[PDB]
Structures are given as structure tokens and as C-alpha cells.
Amino acid sequence: ARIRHVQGDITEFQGDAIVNAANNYLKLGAGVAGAILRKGGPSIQEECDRIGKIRVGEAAVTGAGNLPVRYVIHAAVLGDEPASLETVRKATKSALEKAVELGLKTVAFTSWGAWVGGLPAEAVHRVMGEEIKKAPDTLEVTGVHGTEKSAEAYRRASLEH
């Protein structure tokens, strides 16, 4: 699937779904997840509680409450196991699989930087990029970045080559 890189707040993404990097317990905290709790509202954690624990590397879908998307796809990158390039690969693939199963088109990711600080950044980018590339072209992916400088850096890299 194609990806477009933009600056923004993923909780303002208007489209079919946002991907939420998660622990496998599916319990939300601060950061992007905190914005989801607040802006999405109580139904998101309530539905996560109804799903219960999943395995690291899997994904699970909830509604999105008052967010401007239909679904939140929670992608379990760590929790009862530490993050690894393998868990990143599996969680990205699993999140995309859920989007395909739901018949979605537009899906947003963050860089997952705040979940992968112990892993080589270039490798994380490669593995996520590879899984997104392999996903069907029925999906259109948006990468949402905190700063314009960084969003543009991702765009420039997408040219070369």
C-alpha cells in the first residue's frame, strides 16, 4: 500500500481508522493513547477491557468513540514481552490485516517512536515500511508526524529511492 507522510495529530485524522501502538494487555496510558482516551472517550478502554489480553504481535479492533474515524486498531508491540524488530513487524502486519478484514481504505499510523526506543530507528522504519508496502492497494496509509521538519524528511526519503 501507498503511504503519505504528514505533520499532525493522529487523533484528528479523518478517515476509516487509526492504528494505536499498544501493550498486549490493551491498557491505555499517556502519549497518543492518552489523547485517544480523552478525545475518544470512555468507550475505547471499555471495549479494550471486553477484548482482554492479546498476544504481543497481534492486533485488536475497537470503536473510536468521539474520534473522527470509525475504528481504532490497537497493535500490540510490547507488554509481557519487550519490543523487538519481530514484534514491530508482526504488530504492523496484524494491524493492516485487521484493516483489510474490515474493508477499510484510509488508515493512519504514528512512527511508534515512543514504543521502540531500544531498537535501531532505521531498522524499525524499514520493517514497518516493508509491511505497509506489502499490504493491498485497497489501503491508503497516512504516516502522521509531530513536526513538519520530520514529516518532510520522511517524504524526501521516499524519493531516494
Ligand X SMILES: *[P@@](=O)(CCCCCCCCCCOC(=O)NCCCCCC#C)OCC
Closer residue to Cl ion (CB): 32 or 83: 32
Q: Determine if 32 is a binding residue for Cl ion (CB under 5 A).
A: yes
Please confirm whether the linkage preceding 125 is cis (ω < 30° from 0): no
From Cl ion, ligand X, none, which one binds at residue 41 (CB under 5 to 8 Å depending on kind)?
none
Q: Which is nearer to ligand X, 25 or 154 (CB)?
A: 154
Long-range contacts (CB closer than 8 Å, 24 or more residues apart) made by 49-58: 51/26, 52/26, 53/24, 53/25, 53/26, 54/24, 54/26, 55/24, 56/24, 56/80, 56/81, 56/87, 56/90, 56/91, 57/86, 57/87, 57/90, 57/91, 57/94, 58/24, 58/90, 58/91, 58/94
> What does 93 interact with, of ligand X, Cl ion, none (CB < 5 to 8 A by kind)?
none
Contacts (CB under 5 A) with Cl ion, residues 95-134: 110, 114
In the bound state with ligand X, the residue whose beta carbon lies nearer, of 60 and 135, is: 135
| One of 1, 3, 17, 21 touching Cl ion (CB under 5 A) | 21
Helix (H) or strand (E) holding 142: strand 140-145
CA angle 146/8/142 to nearest 5° reads 100
Least distance in Å: CB of 150 to ligand X? 3
Q: Which stretch binds ligand X (CB under 6 A): 27-35, 40-48, 60-68, 105-113?
A: 105-113
Residues making contact with Cl ion (CB under 5 A): 21, 32, 110, 114
Residues that bind ligand X (CB under 6 A): 3, 109-111, 125, 128-129, 132, 143-145, 149-150, 153-154, 157
